[PDB]
Design a protein around this ligand. Sequence first.
Ligand SMILES: OC[C@H]1O[C@H](OC[C@H]2O[C@@H](O)[C@@H](O)[C@@H](O)[C@@H]2O)[C@@H](O)[C@@H](O)[C@@H]1O
Length: 426
Amino acid sequence: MVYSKEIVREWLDEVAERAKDYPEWVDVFERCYTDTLDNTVEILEDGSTFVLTGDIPAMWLRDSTAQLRPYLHVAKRDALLRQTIAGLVKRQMTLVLKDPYANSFNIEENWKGHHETDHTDLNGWIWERKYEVDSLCYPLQLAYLLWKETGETSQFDEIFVAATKEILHLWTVEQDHKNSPYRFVRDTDRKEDTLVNDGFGPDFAVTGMTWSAFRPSDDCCQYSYLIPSNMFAVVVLGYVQEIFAALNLADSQSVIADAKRLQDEIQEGIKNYAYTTNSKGEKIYAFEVDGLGNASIMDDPNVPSLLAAPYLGYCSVDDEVYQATRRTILSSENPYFYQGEYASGLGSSHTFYRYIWPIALSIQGLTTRDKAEKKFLLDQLVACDGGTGVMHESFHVDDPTLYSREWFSWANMMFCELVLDYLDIR
Ligand SMILES: OC[C@H]1O[C@H](OC[C@H]2O[C@@H](O)[C@@H](O)[C@@H](O)[C@@H]2O)[C@@H](O)[C@@H](O)[C@@H]1O
């Protein structure tokens, strides 16, 4: 029992009626919305919620949050699903305590996943131990949004408090990666899947920002300060201060101060190091910097991205530097911007050349005030599905029957996000 079929069907009817002029949107929305709930979510022995990604049979801290986020609206009516989502926070925080450096986790201590190729400290709960700053943002974001959307507070238990302390500590240690206990080397010929310098990663200076090993694409950072994830960290560090103050949790005074101090330092770090200049001389955000003067000009479709900055709450969609960044990202000045017969959009080091991501099309829609652009991107999302009726990881710009990931629940849910945004559902 993860949700109430009766309440969810009624909410869907209400959505379908709001979107009645777009039957093509509705069919895709319902297929995607139903799939996540019936096929990716399960309640464990201990009453917590394990959420798998889809066609990779493991749980990402990133994916699992984005997967359940659109259910917050109906969770205001469906108290059972509200519990389910509180159980996901509970599972996430428990797994953070298991290993706060891992992106991905198993259903139990079973040693499924990548241990055989991977040289790092491991245990049987870990699917792979690729450290991505945003992996630790997402569970704090889910906890906060569950609280604000529904009023639920049961997720804020001793596990939550301990996991928050772990995150703050790890983020602090990673303000100077020289003190880090984390190393990762994978037996592979694909360099994006391992860390240079015998697992240490590329050179950097201290900036005040917090170091990451890998991106939310699961490919490794070129430079260690990944600006979108540090943007996300600043936001969720605000949530930490709100939750601890509103709820008088254990050690509130010390946690609020530690979180505030880290937030200020990461924010000062962004200010001092995160900006570069485009071909036209405009100030823009860099994607990755090292603090030694290198700064890449690009964006990757995975969230957190530069494109997603207003979506994650870091800045206003109206911000001048964001807008200049956006124009640079959605142009050939970005080496990952691809243009074909069916669509133009964002590819990734992680996917085949010429393949662009539905997640970034959705985010592009979510980060413009322009309703005609939202409607265009929705129509294109539906038209570039290879006749499947669901969202893929990536599809060829010249032929969307060429795609990756048959079953990618996170991407299905980002399509849902944009439809809800279009119908003014928030
Ligand atoms: O982002 C998911 C996943 O992407 C890469 O591996 C994809 C896929 O490769 C297969 O050969 C197999 O290893 C399967 O288990 C794996 O999911 C890679 O970057 C990986 O680290 C990452 O988890």
